[PDB]
Design a protein around this nucleic acid. Structure first.
Ligand SMILES: [K+]
Ligand SMILES: [K+]
Ligand SMILES: [K+]
Ligand SMILES: [K+]
Ligand SMILES: [K+]
Ligand SMILES: [K+]
Ligand SMILES: [Mg+2]
Ligand SMILES: [Mg+2]
Ligand SMILES: [Mg+2]
Ligand SMILES: [Mg+2]
Ligand SMILES: [Mg+2]
Ligand SMILES: [Mg+2]
Ligand SMILES: [Mg+2]
Ligand SMILES: [Mg+2]
Ligand SMILES: [Mg+2]
Ligand SMILES: [Mg+2]
Ligand SMILES: [Mg+2]
Ligand SMILES: [Mg+2]
Ligand SMILES: [Mg+2]
Ligand SMILES: [Mg+2]
Ligand SMILES: [Mg+2]
Ligand SMILES: [Mg+2]
Ligand SMILES: [Mg+2]
Ligand SMILES: [Mg+2]
Ligand SMILES: [Mg+2]
Ligand SMILES: [Mg+2]
Ligand SMILES: [Mg+2]
Ligand SMILES: [Mg+2]
Ligand SMILES: [Mg+2]
Ligand SMILES: [Mg+2]
Ligand SMILES: [Mg+2]
Ligand SMILES: [Mg+2]
Lengths: 154, 237, 102, 53, 64, 123, 66, 49, 467
RNA sequence: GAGCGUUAAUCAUAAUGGUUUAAAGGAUCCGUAGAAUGAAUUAUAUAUUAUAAUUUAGAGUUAAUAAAAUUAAUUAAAGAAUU
RNA sequence: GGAUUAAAACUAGAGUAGCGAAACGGAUUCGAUACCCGUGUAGUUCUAGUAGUAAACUAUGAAUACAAUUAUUUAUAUAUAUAUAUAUAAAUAAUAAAUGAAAAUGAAAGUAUUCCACCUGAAGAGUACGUUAGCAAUAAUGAAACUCAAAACAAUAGACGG
RNA sequence: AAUAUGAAUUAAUGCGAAGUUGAAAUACAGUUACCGUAGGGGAACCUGCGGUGGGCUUAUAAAUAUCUUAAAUAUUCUUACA
């Protein structure tokens, strides 16, 4: 769901403004892939599976009995009195989805505004979804993949 | 109030003054602050345990952990509404510290109201010097009071001499009565023995109270008379 | 105040900053691009040492609030590559600068 | 990441779940039925004070 | 007033920060009760002796 | 507006100057015949005796044209050429007559800005 | 009092007890040691150290510290 | 990655250009008396007189 | 799919390495060592990592119970000598990388730190101990030698009764376990921090960064790391009393004082011919009992290495341990019992000591062969990003408690000064607690200085003489 | 500059917008179309869509237990005062 | 598209005490087609309908996810050394952050998402014409020409106030 | 029937200058203003009915207070005592 992803993007911005060290997001494949990309890129300190009440200390298998109570817990980073994850916005919106070929993704990473999408800025992360997998735009260009431009994180 | 930035970055703002040349001379604090960086995260931190009672914070009991029926005779097969509400706020709210001794302390002073009348000094001397062996109630350095009973009760339950808290508490209470009776006699006898050897005392406690009551009853006499004369005039109207 | 400058000529990336009623859209520019911005912003860039910059002002074009907004944007809306790298624990490479390196 | 997101209930787990859920519904129906009979008994004890003739 | 002037003047500051006090307004906060004279005088004394040791070490290096 | 409202027509209004000489019919100038020469009073705070003229254009539109320059020889039945441009202080006078065209002569003894007053160059 | 809490101090709180917040002394000690080293450094460097306290009774401590 | 090496050749691939050193070498073989000067790949257009 | 043996995580600008083998008490195998060795080379090249933190995920149960020698024993029984030599080349190469690492490494010794664990901390100037620390080198009971460069570290860092490596030989030959505060006072731990304060300390370590134009490899940053840890140090428990009394320190300093060609028999003679207090005499018998339940060959090899790696540079000392380990797994001359003893204790649970058979006295040539590289087996330590060697640790002294040789140097210097003044115990305490910048206010520094003066100095008039 | 000016026109010059109080929230709700938008897991396909199976966090149904006596429509009554 | 929709008004049949447009008188006033007083018709009431308009206002469309505190009630639940205490929601009040032209908003007028309605200088004008609906009053829909460089909001310091 | 043109005839409105008759609005604007609707009047406007605040949140006391060693002891204290 792009709506759920929009909710998570706004939630992370709200948490950064108040500078909470730990927060939770919905437990879904897309959310987990989204969070994992942020973790590998250094935007998130930690990524743990858990419940509504907090991160799990020991592995708890997820089943239909507890799926409704599952959450993903992420740790936010702050350095030099500044949040590492300052902004998080969707590019492809629920009511206007944007699919780009690899050629247009290369233009976006080169400073060209494609379909009103402002080009990639220094130190910014743009994520792309292709065949239900989320990857960095630079990685999609390396794999010659065409996909939906989901969001941009800075 | 907004998280301030300029108080913790004095070193970085100063460094720009020196590099540009706006400030010719390095301040004396400059080197000290550089070697000892200020903390500048100002984040809210989660907590997963109450330090007082060791209760775990942030743990959800899954339905798989409640296989048996409840007090109503029903099994739990699905999460309830409370289980489905995010509880992040509990991770950040300062835990309420609780102690079993607090319950006993309230009981002791409910059973012995006049123990409250014995003045207590809250000013600490040195908490780290307290070397107490609670096998006995009396201790060198601290008064005999309700706390002596509570600590004795805990030692009994900690050593497992008694199982029920009530039994340990009752045992400690009797030890407290014995010590209180020996002191009430030492004071009575000491006064009696001194008077028998020619000790003289200016004012007794009973006398002190009479004098203080006289001072108050004298002002009260004047006002009563004054207010019983204004009434007579005002009522005459 | 000191303002971060990328290669001591321009800003780090693009800035979309709102100062009261003034909407400032500033874009970094290539070497030799010059200053193509509101006249108020031009003077500030000259004193600050910014040589290449593009941008547009939207909504309110009050000179006083443009100047203050610009100064605030140059400090509160920029992040150096070094600061981004340290916060994220990653290496950030300027491809154009590496292309002309040994 | 390699862990599966969800593990489907085994056929046996679904059987035990259905047993508990059927029991829960049956117990509540029985308890309500017995409560109604206990109120009918307490009403019989006092029907000698009620007038119908 | 004093804290804001120190910020404007780039003067590092130390302060006792109680639960109702803003930590970010000082360079080096010390969390602690600021209402009791015993608590304040205990913390002030420690800082004062630390300064004294620094002063004695500076006067000692001058002698030798 | 929402994305669907924009799809249905919602959008920013367009900015384009509107015609201030509708009677000319998108022509640089139109010939006309003076119906009556008149003198009008500026709207406040201006004071003057502004010379104007009512003109019937070759397209049938009747307009009021300001006669620029010091002194004019325009009369009734005189052939005049009318161009765009309003007289700001005279409401309803939205056009100008061209000096030195038709039966309206150039300003007598004009030295500066002669081209604007139909004055030929002195030898 | 917990009623007067400035939530920006949340990370310094050990818990609440008897209607007041208990400050975490483990953090106080670490902050106190850090602050003390700064005072020692500035003193050893010859800097001017000003002690400001305007609550009743603080003068005696302030004068001796200086 | 924080410890990933990135050099001029890697940058050239990113920008889809020949390495800068190659450009310098190709610009030194342009002189009429310089080494490497070659022009024959174009002699493949049928002409009739 | 399986939990990785070692977990790597980012802590702001600090990189946390966590040992993740709880069921094995964080035992170090070739996989763990190789992973850590490779990841540390990358962090050395990185310009965003300021320091590294080596901890365990099992604290306070254990930090590292020692290298995985039970698996090396099975290799020997299966003649998989190539596998065994790989395990020691990886471990010893990782110990050499840590010793010469140019960025601060901070080891949290929160639990059992025995064997390989000692190699993970002994080579770092910032080795923090806790109440749960249990330092020991129990190799003599398994038939092995003191490895992981412990024959180069202990003779150079121990604080008391270590003038001639007497205390170093006592710990390596007896396998005595030192606990918490005692490890800090002996010099085994640079700092003593309560376990409860480790979380806060870790966060502060990630937040500190070199100032201005100083790299994390500069001495200036090393001082900053030391100060940060000190802010979390707390005063020792009031009841705490040092483990070894002066009388017990006199037995070790005399009974383990050998020459450049000493032998384990010489130590046995001193322990059997010791004279003095009743406690000292009884203490010497306790050591004699213990030293007679060890491997007769291991004790001689340990003494050889201590007398060889106490005056050599780090690289040659670590390399000599690789040769010894390889020359022991492959028992060409049937002079050791490392493999059989290891199975008797680890592979098979047997409280009783392994009955020893090699009870002879190896010659100087025999010891040389066991501790020298065989020309047929070429083994070399993996290359690190520093590739440097030196005879003295570059930072250990500045940030640990002073040794008995440093206090002596100041008494001799002060006593031989033109001032013509008298050295007084009070002046010694002040000079070590309130003078040296890196030692100012160091925990348990005055207590250690008083132990040294009461046992090493002679108080005549208002002066002190170095007996 | 052999053009210059002027008139007539075209493009550009702010929606990288707004609607408490400045132009602008429909009196309110119900609900049809929507070529509007919208959960979870897995597997395929021709792939942000389709299909199938599965799931319960949205949305509902029925009970049990406790709580409340209001809001509509209708019928039947009361009250102080006024003329 | 449908339904409901204050007051006034209208169509029938009842009712009509009090109140009360209008009208007729009395005062006040330079004058008083007013304010005040009298007599007081429609109306105000009920029954059955028509009509669908209000400063019909929170001048703020609905829904979902989310973000820092306090106080005060309410509800549910839990516990007991039985009346408090501990929890979780709702409401209200004051706020942090954020937003804003500011006044201020404060869980939205914040961070986001989805759908609908609506606006594009003033005046002309919610007017003209046409159409639709209604017994009617009217309601809905809804322009252009001409003219002008205005027009409007928040806030600031004054001046003034029967 | 539509489109266009003129058209008897007839409706609404803008601007321009000053005057005339009142003083309706802005302060409690001298009867609170305004919204819907109805009736009336030279003109603004007046009156009835309901609604709104873009007017009254502009909100600010029926007062009364207590006992333990006043000092040879607290008040002094400068890294000392322990
Ligand atoms: K607004
Ligand atoms: K009536
Ligand atoms: K709507
Ligand atoms: K009026
Ligand atoms: K009205
Ligand atoms: K009216
Ligand atoms: Mg306070
Ligand atoms: Mg030309
Ligand atoms: Mg445009
Ligand atoms: Mg809106
Ligand atoms: Mg509304
Ligand atoms: Mg409206
Ligand atoms: Mg439900
Ligand atoms: Mg009403
Ligand atoms: Mg009627
Ligand atoms: Mg009349
Ligand atoms: Mg009259
Ligand atoms: Mg009347
Ligand atoms: Mg109707
Ligand atoms: Mg109307
Ligand atoms: Mg309306
Ligand atoms: Mg209403
Ligand atoms: Mg609804
Ligand atoms: Mg109408
Ligand atoms: Mg206003
Ligand atoms: Mg009047
Ligand atoms: Mg008036
Ligand atoms: Mg009025
Ligand atoms: Mg009237
Ligand atoms: Mg009215
Ligand atoms: Mg008003
Ligand atoms: Mg008001």
């Amino acid at each position: 769901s792009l709506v759920k992803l929009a909710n998570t993007c706004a939630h992370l911005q709200n948490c950064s403004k108040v500078r909470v060290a730990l927060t939770s997001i919905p437990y879904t494949k897309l959310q987990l892939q989204f969070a994992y990309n942020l973790y590998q890129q250094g935007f998130l300190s930690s990524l743990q599976k858990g419940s509504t009440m907090g991160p799990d200390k020991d592995f708890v298998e997820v089943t239909p009995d507890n799926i409704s109570t599952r959450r993903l817990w992420v740790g936010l980073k702050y350095r030099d009195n500044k949040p590492v994850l300052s902004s998080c916005k969707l590019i492809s919106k629920p009511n206007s989805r944007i699919h780009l070929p690899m050629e247009d993704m290369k233009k976006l990473c080169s400073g060209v505004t494609i379909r009103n999408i402002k080009p990639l800025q220094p130190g910014e992360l743009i994520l792309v979804r292709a065949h239900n997998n989320i990857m960095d735009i630079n990685e999609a260009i390396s794999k010659k993949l065409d996909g939906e431009v989901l969001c941009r994180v800075k | 109030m907004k998280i301030q930035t300029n108080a913790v970055n004095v070193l970085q703002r100063t460094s720009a003054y020196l590099k540009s040349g706006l400030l010719k001379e390095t301040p004396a604090w400059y080197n000290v602050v550089a070697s000892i960086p200020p903390s500048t995260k100002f984040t809210r931190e989660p907590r997963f345990k109450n330090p007082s009672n060791g209760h775990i914070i942030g743990k959800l009991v899954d339905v798989t952990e409640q296989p048996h029926a409840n007090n109503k005779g029903l099994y739990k097969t699905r999460p309830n509404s409370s289980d489905k509400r995010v509880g992040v706020k509990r991770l950040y709210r300062p835990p309420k510290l609780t102690y079993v001794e607090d319950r006993l302390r309230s009981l002791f002073y409910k059973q012995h109201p006049w123990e409250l009348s014995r003045p207590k000094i809250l000013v600490e001397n040195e908490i780290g010097d307290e070397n107490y062996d609670w096998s006995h109630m009396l201790q060198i350095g601290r008064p005999l009071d309700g706390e002596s009973v509570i600590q004795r009760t805990m030692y009994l339950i900690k050593t497992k001499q008694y199982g029920d808290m009530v039994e340990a508490y009752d045992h400690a209470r009797y030890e407290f009565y014995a010590l209180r009776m020996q002191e009430e006699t030492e004071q009575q006898v000491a006064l009696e023995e001194a008077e028998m050897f020619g000790s003289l005392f200016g004012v007794s406690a009973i006398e002190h109270g009479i004098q203080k009551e006289q001072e108050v009853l004298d002002v009260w006499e004047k006002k009563v008379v004054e207010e019983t004369e204004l009434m007579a005039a005002r009522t005459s109207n | 105040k000191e303002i971060p400058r990328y290669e001591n000529r321009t800003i780090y990336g693009d800035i979309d900053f709102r100062y009261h009623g003034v909407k400032l859209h500033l874009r970094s520019a290539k070497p030799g691009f010059g200053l193509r911005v509101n006249h108020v912003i031009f003077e500030i860039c000259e004193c600050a040492g910014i040589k290449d910059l593009s941008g547009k002002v939207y909504k309110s074009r009050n000179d006083m609030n443009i100047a203050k907004g610009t100064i605030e944007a140059f400090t509160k809306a920029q992040k150096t590559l070094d600061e981004v790298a340290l916060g994220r624990g990653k290496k950030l490479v300027d491809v154009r600068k590496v292309y002309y390196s040994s | 990441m390699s862990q599966p997101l969800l593990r489907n209930r085994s056929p046996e787990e679904s059987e035990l779940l259905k047993l508990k859920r059927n029991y829960n519904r049956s117990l509540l129906n029985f308890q309500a039925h017995k409560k109604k009979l206990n109120e009918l008994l307490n009403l019989y004890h006092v029907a000698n004070e009620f007038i119908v003739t | 007033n004093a804290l804001l002037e120190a910020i404007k003047s780039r003067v590092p500051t130390i302060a006792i920060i109680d639960t109702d006090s803003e930590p970010s307004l000082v360079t080096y906060p010390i969390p602690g009760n600021d209402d009791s004279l015993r608590s304040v005088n205990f913390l002030l004394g420690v800082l004062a002796r630390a300064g004294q040791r620094g002063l004695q070490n500076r006067l000692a290096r001058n002698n030798e | 507006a929402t994305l669907n409202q924009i799809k249905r027509g919602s959008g920013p209004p367009r900015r384009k100057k509107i015609s201030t000489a509708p009677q000319l019919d998108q022509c640089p100038q139109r010939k006309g015949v003076v119906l009556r020469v008149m003198v009008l009073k500026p709207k406040k705070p201006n004071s003057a005796q502004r010379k104007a003229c009512r003109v019937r254009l070759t397209n049938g539109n009747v307009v009021s044209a300001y006669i620029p320059g010091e002194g004019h020889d325009a009369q009734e039945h005189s052939i005049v050429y009318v161009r765009g441009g309003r007289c700001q202080d005279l409401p309803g006078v939205k056009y100008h007559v061209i000096r030195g065209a038709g039966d309206l002569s150039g300003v007598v003894n004009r030295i500066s800005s002669r081209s604007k007053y139909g004055a030929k160059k002195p030898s | 009092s917990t009623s007067l809490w400035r939530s920006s101090t949340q990370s310094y709180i050990y818990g609440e007890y008897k209607g007041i917040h208990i400050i975490d002394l483990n953090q106080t000690l670490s902050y106190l040691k850090r602050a003390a080293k700064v005072v020692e450094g500035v003193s050893e460097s010859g800097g001017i150290i000003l002690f400001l306290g305007t609550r009743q009774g603080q003068k005696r401590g302030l004068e001796e510290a200086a | 990655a924080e410890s990933e090496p990135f050099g001029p050749v890697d940058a050239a691939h990113v920008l889809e250009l020949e390495p800068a050193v190659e450009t310098l070498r190709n610009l030194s073989t342009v002189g009429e008396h310089s080494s490497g000067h070659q022009q024959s790949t174009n002699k493949n257009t049928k002409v009739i007189y | 799919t399986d939990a990785p043996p070692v977990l790597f995580t980012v802590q702001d600008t600090a990189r946390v390495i966590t040992l993740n083998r709880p069921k094995k008490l964080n035992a170090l195998n070739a996989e763990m060592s190789e992973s850590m060795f490779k990841t540390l080379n990358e962090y050395a090249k990185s310009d965003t990592t300021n320091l590294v933190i080596l901890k365990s995920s099992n604290r306070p149960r254990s930090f590292c119970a020692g290298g995985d020698v039970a698996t090396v024993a099975i290799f020997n029984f299966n003649k998989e000598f190539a596998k065994s030599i790989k395990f020691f080349t990886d471990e010893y190469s990782l110990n050499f990388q840590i010793a010469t690492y140019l960025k601060p490494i901070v080891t949290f010794m929160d639990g059992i730190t025995m064997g390989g664990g000692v190699g993970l901390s002994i080579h770092t100037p910032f080795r923090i101990a806790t109440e749960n620390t249990k330092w020991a080198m129990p190799e003599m009971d398994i038939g092995f030698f003191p490895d992981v460069g412990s024959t180069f570290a202990l003779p150079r860092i121990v604080t008391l009764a270590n003038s001639n490596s007497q205390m170093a030989l006592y710990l390596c030959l007896t396998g005595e376990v030192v606990t918490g505060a005692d490890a800090y006072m002996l010099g085994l731990a640079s700092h003593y921090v309560s376990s409860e304060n480790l979380d806060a300390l870790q966060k502060r370590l990630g937040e500190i960064s070199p100032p201005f134009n100083n790299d994390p490899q500069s001495a200036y940053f090393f001082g900053m790391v030391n100060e940060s840890i000190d802010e979390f140090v707390s005063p020792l428990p009031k009841d705490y009393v040092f483990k070894y009394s002066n009388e017990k320190l006199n037995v070790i300093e005399a009974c383990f004082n050998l020459s450049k060609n000493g032998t384990i028999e010489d130590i046995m003679n001193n322990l059997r011919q010791y004279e003095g207090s009743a406690e000292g005499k009884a203490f010497a018998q306790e050591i004699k009992t213990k030293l007679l339940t060890k491997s007769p060959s291991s004790l001689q090899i340990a003494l050889r290495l201590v007398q060889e790696n106490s005056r050599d540079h780090i690289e040659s000392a670590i390399k000599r341990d690789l040769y010894t380990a390889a020359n022991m797994c492959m028992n060409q001359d049937s002079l050791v019992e490392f493999s059989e003893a290891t199975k008797h204790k680890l592979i098979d649970k047997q409280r009783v000591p392994y009955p020893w058979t090699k009870k002879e006295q190896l010659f100087v040539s025999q010891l040389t062969s066991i501790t020298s590289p065989k020309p047929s087996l070429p083994m070399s330590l993996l290359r690190n990003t520093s590739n440097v060697t030196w005879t003295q640790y570059p930072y250990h002294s500045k940030y640990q408690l002073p040794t008995e040789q440093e206090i002596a140097a100041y008494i001799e210097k002060r006593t031989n000064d033109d001032t013509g003044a008298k050295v007084t115990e009070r002046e010694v305490l002040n000079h070590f607690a309130n003078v040296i910048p890196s030692r100012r206010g160091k925990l348990g520094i005055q207590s250690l200085c008083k132990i040294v003066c009461e046992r090493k100095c002679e108080e005549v008039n208002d002066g002190l003489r170095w007996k």
